[PDB]
Design a protein around this ligand. Structure first.
Ligand SMILES: [Zn+2]
Ligand SMILES: [Zn+2]
Lengths: 195, 232, 232, 195
């Protein structure tokens, strides 16, 4: 009955998150609202998330991504893929069909199905930024819509990004709310006005 | 592409054993109340023909099955009684896996809230009508007095007095009530009496909205709560 | 070469379970209203002998099956109530794939439009008679007064007053009405009054056309809307 | 519930479409009407669509054809072959029986059945014009009549022609209305007069 911690912890490496600009077009596949600290994106579409640090983490460091429900009444509930989509061939072989969050582009990804908590998570090795670039970029895939009956079922989620040493010890944490939908741009504008 | 969603009949003949179900629909996989019901019976699920909190309290784990939130007598009885409102997709995913799913991942929303101006998810709540003494005034047994009396009572009300609008002689003690729930057929004498006794008078919408929000809301936080409000 | 189109009987006994059908026809694979209804039954489809929005609103997914668009009472009731008008070929194709087909690809036309002068496709629409106050006048209970009163109401009318042409004493308030739907048996007193009260008066073709087009059209946009219009 | 886009987009290559002239004889198998930007043609008859461009697209580029219903009330519904015709041997094997649009003559033609939208599309590789010619001609086949019950069912459609890079990114878009019918020329004249 333990809800993973979601408190911002820049840590010793000064860990921060970065996203890409995308405006509010309806053809936009992923857009992030600084105002809401919430990413709006579509099913199975690429979601770039940027890792920024002030000091370089020693190789052997990992980056974990995990989804938890945002509402207090559901926090203890495990976030998973609805049955309908578990029964779909989109399985790239690497990712267990029950995982909401996936990583594309990286061949060293591991999937954790936590025997004690029962939560799902996807982790990859930490890699320094690319030369000529100030940040490591990981590409995430959300395999269900926020509305999926049987899955997220309309409940908003938070994605927690964790920086860990090889032994799993916390080095840093950040997080952002996510809404997987048909019109990311449209929904971003709608929600930003609602403030 | 339609059986796909539907799912098969449960191979495990006792998949829903120990459960009772109440089905309704309003007026996104089309909801086939017939096939869904055969799926439940094929798994020994018990089919309740009308709300009954006897079996829902002792004999079975009752669930209301529907395609979305509704404003029906049965939806209200369940929201008021804490019987969960579940999507029929739960029955289908359960037959598909020949294994009971977590209905907590299939909850239907409670309903449309006038105050919030949007659909509200369902969340745990206290009896909204706990220890409320109600006086129901209307010119229809079934539809109003029989209907709301039941809903208010299972909603934790201490007492509900039915009193036929016109066809009833005002020999009651209006001071003993907290609220008068009524419609446009309310006798001017009662309104005038309530006004002086400072006892609030509302419309059924007040009751429904409390059921949807999950709490006792303002007797006057919205026009539709005036007993005399008409479409327009 | 005639069984070919027809298709077989369903094989799958529960093919149409949860569906209810209403059948009609006028007065392109020959429409066999006999084989069709037997195919339906073999699939546990429910056969509605007459229109009933009770079952169509809470119990079954209702569909009207015919060979083409019609001008029968059932066709009109379905257009007025939002029940889909589907081609019997949907039944035939389904009994063939032993799987339900998407009825949305088999919608019949709504009907022939006078104003447009062509057959019009059906498309979603608001209640064409929403909150309308009608006065029905005729010398025939069944065929007119009963017939149209039911269609108007199902289509959204706020009220319909049935008034037997001759056999009826004019103690009505013609100002409360929006329209008078009548035929050549309309008493001249009613007409002279309606005129003086600026109350428009029309034939049943006005109603029919409203149902075909999907909206309330001009009381006088076509001669046939005159209640006294005669063949000729 | 996303309706594929139909906005003209000539793009960086200046992509335009072209059609052959074919008057209004009753023997004509495919006739285009500029006034309506509409092609009238017969079942399974060859329909030549010409691809014009100002700059030559890099090879690896693709041309995707897709049909969407034209009327708003039906745009979200997927255009497909009626069941009656799916049950017909005209299946050149290459083409899944459920596709309305086919391409003849080419051999590199692929048939997309989109797992998320459910729409059908047919895409072949882009090829530069023929020497002595100013445009690339693609031959399309429409396997059902606009009137097929259980199919287009009298609903008019639009064919959306898309120029894509090898990664699926949009490069160009154009479109025309289509009526598959018994008498192309007769109908063309009838509809042009109704203006
Ligand atoms: Zn899902
Ligand atoms: Zn066809």
């Amino acid at each position: 009955s333990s809800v993973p911690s979601q408190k911002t912890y820049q840590g010793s490496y000064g860990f921060r998150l970065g996203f890409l600009h995308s405006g509010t077009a309806k053809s936009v596949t992923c857009t992030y609202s600084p105002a809401l600290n919430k990413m709006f994106c579509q099913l199975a579409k690429t979601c770039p998330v940027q890792l920024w640090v002030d000091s370089t983490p020693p190789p052997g460091t990992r980056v974990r991504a995990m989804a938890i429900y945002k509402q207090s009444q559901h926090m203890t509930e495990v976030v998973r893929r609805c049955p309908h989509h578990e029964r779909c061939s989109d399985s790239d072989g690497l990712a267990p069909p029950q995982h909401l969050i996936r990583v594309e582009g990286n061949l060293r990804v591991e999937y954790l199905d936590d025997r004690n908590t029962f939560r799902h998570s996807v982790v990859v090795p930490y890699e320094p930024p690319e030369v000529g670039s100030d940040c490591t970029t990981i590409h995430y895939n959300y395999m269900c819509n926020s509305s999926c009956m049987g899955g997220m079922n309309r409940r908003p989620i938070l994605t927690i990004i964790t920086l860990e040493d090889s032994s799993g010890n916390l080095l840093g944490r950040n997080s952002f709310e996510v809404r997987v939908c048909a019109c990311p741009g449209r929904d971003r504008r709608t929600e930003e006005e609602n403030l | 592409a339609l059986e796909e969603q539907r799912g098969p009949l449960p191979l495990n003949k006792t998949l829903f054993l120990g459960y009772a179900f109440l089905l309704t629909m309003a007026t996104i996989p089309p909801f086939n109340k017939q096939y869904t019901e055969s799926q439940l019976r094929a798994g020994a699920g018990y089919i309740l023909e009308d709300f009954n909190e006897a079996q829902c309290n002792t004999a079975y784990q009752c669930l209301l099955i529907a395609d979305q939130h509704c404003r029906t007598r049965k939806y209200f009885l369940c929201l008021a009684s804490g019987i969960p409102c579940v999507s029929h997709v739960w029955v289908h995913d359960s037959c598909h896996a020949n294994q009971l799913q977590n209905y907590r991942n299939y909850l239907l929303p409670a309903g449309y809230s006038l105050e919030e101006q949007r659909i509200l998810d369902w969340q745990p709540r206290e009896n909204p009508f706990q220890n409320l003494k109600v006086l129901l005034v209307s010119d229809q047994q079934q539809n109003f007095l029989e209907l709301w009396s039941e809903i208010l009572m299972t909603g934790g009300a201490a007492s509900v007095k039915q009193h036929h609008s016109s066809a009833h002689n005002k020999d009651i003690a209006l001071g003993v009530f907290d609220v008068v729930v009524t419609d446009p057929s309310c006798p001017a004498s009662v309104l005038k009496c309530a006004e002086a006794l400072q006892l609030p008078v509302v419309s059924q919408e007040w009751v429904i909205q409390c059921l949807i929000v999950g709490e006792r809301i303002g007797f006057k936080q919205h026009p539709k709560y005036k007993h005399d409000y008409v479409s327009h």
